[PDB]
Design a protein around this ligand. Sequence first.
Ligand SMILES: COC1=C(OC)C(=O)C(C/C=C(\C)CC/C=C(\C)CC/C=C(\C)CC/C=C(\C)CC/C=C(\C)CC/C=C(\C)CC/C=C(\C)CCC=C(C)C)=C(C)C1=O
Length: 168
Amino acid sequence: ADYKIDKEGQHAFIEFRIKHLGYSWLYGRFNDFDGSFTFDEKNPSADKVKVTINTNSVDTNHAERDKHLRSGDFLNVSKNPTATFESTEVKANGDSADITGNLTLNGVTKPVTIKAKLIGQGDDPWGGYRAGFEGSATLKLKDFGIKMDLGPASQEVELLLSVEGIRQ
Ligand SMILES: COC1=C(OC)C(=O)C(C/C=C(\C)CC/C=C(\C)CC/C=C(\C)CC/C=C(\C)CC/C=C(\C)CC/C=C(\C)CC/C=C(\C)CCC=C(C)C)=C(C)C1=O
Protein backbone atom coordinates (compact mmCIF):
# COMPACT_ATOMS: atom_id res chain seq x y z
CA ALA A 1 0.00 0.00 0.00
CA ASP A 2 1.21 3.46 -1.07
CA TYR A 3 0.76 6.63 1.00
CA LYS A 4 0.87 10.34 0.20
CA ILE A 5 2.25 12.55 2.98
CA ASP A 6 -0.48 14.83 4.31
CA LYS A 7 0.90 18.16 3.09
CA GLU A 8 -2.49 19.85 2.70
CA GLY A 9 -3.48 19.00 6.30
CA GLN A 10 0.12 19.74 7.33
CA HIS A 11 0.38 16.53 9.34
CA ALA A 12 4.06 16.32 8.42
CA PHE A 13 7.03 17.96 10.06
CA ILE A 14 10.80 18.29 9.61
CA GLU A 15 12.20 19.65 12.88
CA PHE A 16 15.84 20.26 13.72
CA ARG A 17 18.05 21.46 16.58
CA ILE A 18 21.72 22.53 16.79
CA LYS A 19 23.69 24.08 19.66
CA HIS A 20 24.20 27.84 19.69
CA LEU A 21 27.76 28.39 20.97
CA GLY A 22 27.34 25.07 22.82
CA TYR A 23 25.29 27.12 25.32
CA SER A 24 21.72 26.22 24.30
CA TRP A 25 19.76 24.39 21.61
CA LEU A 26 18.50 26.44 18.66
CA TYR A 27 15.28 24.96 17.16
CA GLY A 28 14.04 25.22 13.60
CA ARG A 29 12.04 23.43 10.91
CA PHE A 30 11.34 23.36 7.17
CA ASN A 31 7.83 24.59 6.36
CA ASP A 32 7.62 23.32 2.76
CA PHE A 33 8.18 19.69 1.82
CA ASP A 34 6.37 16.88 0.07
CA GLY A 35 6.75 13.16 -0.42
CA SER A 36 5.38 9.65 -0.32
CA PHE A 37 6.07 6.20 1.12
CA THR A 38 5.22 2.55 0.66
CA PHE A 39 4.14 0.86 3.90
CA ASP A 40 3.54 -2.83 3.42
CA GLU A 41 3.04 -4.92 6.54
CA LYS A 42 2.67 -8.14 4.46
CA ASN A 43 5.88 -7.51 2.45
CA PRO A 44 8.11 -5.03 4.43
CA SER A 45 10.97 -5.42 1.92
CA ALA A 46 8.86 -3.33 -0.52
CA ASP A 47 9.01 -0.40 1.98
CA LYS A 48 10.31 2.89 0.54
CA VAL A 49 10.16 6.63 1.10
CA LYS A 50 10.98 9.75 -0.94
CA VAL A 51 10.82 13.33 0.33
CA THR A 52 11.61 16.59 -1.47
CA ILE A 53 12.27 19.73 0.63
CA ASN A 54 12.35 23.37 -0.51
CA THR A 55 15.22 24.65 1.62
CA ASN A 56 14.13 28.34 1.44
CA SER A 57 11.32 27.27 3.80
CA VAL A 58 13.88 27.05 6.69
CA ASP A 59 12.30 28.59 9.78
CA THR A 60 14.02 29.29 13.14
CA ASN A 61 11.67 32.15 14.11
CA HIS A 62 14.27 34.87 13.43
CA ALA A 63 14.07 36.68 10.08
CA GLU A 64 17.73 37.77 9.79
CA ARG A 65 19.03 34.37 10.99
CA ASP A 66 16.81 32.63 8.41
CA LYS A 67 18.01 34.97 5.64
CA HIS A 68 21.60 34.11 6.63
CA LEU A 69 20.67 30.39 6.60
CA ARG A 70 19.35 30.77 3.01
CA SER A 71 22.61 32.32 1.79
CA GLY A 72 25.73 30.84 0.16
CA ASP A 73 27.30 30.67 3.65
CA PHE A 74 24.84 27.97 4.67
CA LEU A 75 22.00 26.23 2.78
CA ASN A 76 22.75 28.19 -0.41
CA VAL A 77 19.13 28.14 -1.53
CA SER A 78 19.88 30.10 -4.76
CA LYS A 79 22.26 27.35 -6.06
CA ASN A 80 20.32 24.41 -4.57
CA PRO A 81 16.61 25.17 -3.98
CA THR A 82 15.75 21.59 -2.92
CA ALA A 83 16.94 18.80 -0.65
CA THR A 84 16.04 15.18 -1.43
CA PHE A 85 15.94 12.08 0.70
CA GLU A 86 15.21 8.85 -1.09
CA SER A 87 15.49 5.53 0.74
CA THR A 88 17.69 2.72 -0.56
CA GLU A 89 17.13 0.22 2.30
CA VAL A 90 14.53 -0.31 5.02
CA LYS A 91 15.78 -2.85 7.60
CA ALA A 92 13.93 -4.11 10.69
CA ASN A 93 15.76 -3.14 13.93
CA GLY A 94 14.21 -4.26 17.25
CA ASP A 95 10.87 -2.49 17.74
CA SER A 96 11.57 0.01 14.92
CA ALA A 97 13.14 0.22 11.42
CA ASP A 98 16.35 1.66 9.98
CA ILE A 99 15.70 3.62 6.80
CA THR A 100 18.96 4.15 4.94
CA GLY A 101 18.87 6.44 1.94
CA ASN A 102 20.58 9.12 -0.08
CA LEU A 103 20.31 12.64 1.22
CA THR A 104 21.12 15.31 -1.29
CA LEU A 105 21.54 18.57 0.52
CA ASN A 106 23.40 21.66 -0.76
CA GLY A 107 24.43 19.81 -3.95
CA VAL A 108 26.08 16.95 -1.93
CA THR A 109 24.68 13.36 -1.86
CA LYS A 110 25.58 11.13 1.09
CA PRO A 111 23.76 8.29 2.96
CA VAL A 112 21.63 9.00 6.06
CA THR A 113 19.96 6.41 8.29
CA ILE A 114 16.64 7.36 9.85
CA LYS A 115 15.58 5.43 12.94
CA ALA A 116 11.84 5.09 12.29
CA LYS A 117 8.80 3.83 14.16
CA LEU A 118 5.09 3.51 13.48
CA ILE A 119 3.16 5.92 15.67
CA GLY A 120 -0.40 4.91 14.83
CA GLN A 121 -2.65 3.77 11.99
CA GLY A 122 -6.30 3.09 11.08
CA ASP A 123 -9.35 4.48 9.30
CA ASP A 124 -9.79 8.25 9.61
CA PRO A 125 -13.04 10.15 10.43
CA TRP A 126 -13.58 11.08 6.75
CA GLY A 127 -13.40 7.62 5.14
CA GLY A 128 -9.67 7.39 4.33
CA TYR A 129 -6.91 5.24 5.84
CA ARG A 130 -3.88 6.71 7.61
CA ALA A 131 -0.46 5.60 8.84
CA GLY A 132 1.86 7.92 10.79
CA PHE A 133 5.58 7.66 11.60
CA GLU A 134 8.37 9.23 13.63
CA GLY A 135 11.97 9.39 12.45
CA SER A 136 15.26 10.52 13.93
CA ALA A 137 18.61 11.16 12.26
CA THR A 138 21.60 13.45 12.69
CA LEU A 139 23.99 14.99 10.18
CA LYS A 140 27.36 16.75 10.17
CA LEU A 141 27.20 20.15 8.45
CA LYS A 142 30.67 19.72 6.91
CA ASP A 143 29.62 16.45 5.20
CA PHE A 144 27.20 18.37 3.00
CA GLY A 145 29.61 21.20 2.23
CA ILE A 146 28.07 23.70 4.66
CA LYS A 147 31.07 26.04 4.74
CA MET A 148 30.68 28.33 7.76
CA ASP A 149 32.03 27.09 11.06
CA LEU A 150 29.64 27.72 13.93
CA GLY A 151 32.04 26.70 16.72
CA PRO A 152 33.24 23.33 18.06
CA ALA A 153 29.91 22.17 19.60
CA SER A 154 27.81 23.07 16.54
CA GLN A 155 29.00 20.52 13.93
CA GLU A 156 25.87 18.41 14.08
CA VAL A 157 22.20 19.03 13.64
CA GLU A 158 19.61 16.65 15.08
CA LEU A 159 16.50 15.80 13.03
CA LEU A 160 13.05 14.80 14.32
CA LEU A 161 10.68 13.80 11.57
CA SER A 162 6.94 13.25 11.61
CA VAL A 163 4.90 12.05 8.62
CA GLU A 164 1.23 11.19 8.43
CA GLY A 165 0.33 9.38 5.20
CA ILE A 166 -3.04 9.00 3.48
CA ARG A 167 -3.39 5.62 1.70
CA GLN A 168 -3.97 5.93 -2.07
C1 LIG B 1 22.18 37.60 13.14
O1 LIG B 1 21.57 36.33 12.91
C2 LIG B 1 22.19 35.16 13.26
C3 LIG B 1 21.83 34.49 14.54
O2 LIG B 1 20.88 35.05 15.37
C4 LIG B 1 21.22 35.96 16.41
C5 LIG B 1 22.50 33.21 14.92
O3 LIG B 1 22.19 32.65 15.99
C6 LIG B 1 23.54 32.59 14.03
C7 LIG B 1 24.18 31.28 14.46
C8 LIG B 1 23.24 30.17 14.03
C9 LIG B 1 23.23 28.88 14.46
C10 LIG B 1 24.20 28.36 15.49
C11 LIG B 1 22.20 27.92 13.91
C12 LIG B 1 22.36 27.63 12.41
C13 LIG B 1 21.57 26.39 12.01
C14 LIG B 1 21.98 25.52 11.07
C15 LIG B 1 23.28 25.69 10.33
C16 LIG B 1 21.11 24.31 10.76
C17 LIG B 1 20.40 24.34 9.41
C18 LIG B 1 19.69 23.01 9.18
C19 LIG B 1 20.16 21.99 8.43
C20 LIG B 1 21.49 22.07 7.71
C21 LIG B 1 19.33 20.74 8.31
C22 LIG B 1 19.04 20.34 6.86
C23 LIG B 1 18.04 19.21 6.90
C24 LIG B 1 17.12 18.90 5.95
C25 LIG B 1 16.95 19.68 4.66
C26 LIG B 1 16.22 17.71 6.21
C27 LIG B 1 16.82 16.45 5.61
C28 LIG B 1 15.79 15.34 5.65
C29 LIG B 1 16.06 14.04 5.89
C30 LIG B 1 17.46 13.56 6.16
C31 LIG B 1 14.97 12.99 5.90
C32 LIG B 1 13.62 13.45 5.35
C33 LIG B 1 12.68 12.27 5.39
C34 LIG B 1 11.39 12.29 5.79
C35 LIG B 1 10.68 13.54 6.24
C36 LIG B 1 10.61 10.99 5.75
C37 LIG B 1 10.59 10.25 7.09
C38 LIG B 1 9.77 8.99 6.90
C39 LIG B 1 9.55 8.05 7.86
C40 LIG B 1 10.11 8.19 9.26
C41 LIG B 1 8.71 6.82 7.60
C42 LIG B 1 8.50 6.38 6.15
C43 LIG B 1 7.70 5.09 6.22
C44 LIG B 1 8.03 3.90 5.68
C45 LIG B 1 7.10 2.75 5.88
C46 LIG B 1 9.28 3.66 4.88
C47 LIG B 1 23.89 33.27 12.73
C48 LIG B 1 24.93 32.67 11.81
C49 LIG B 1 23.22 34.55 12.36
O4 LIG B 1 23.50 35.13 11.29
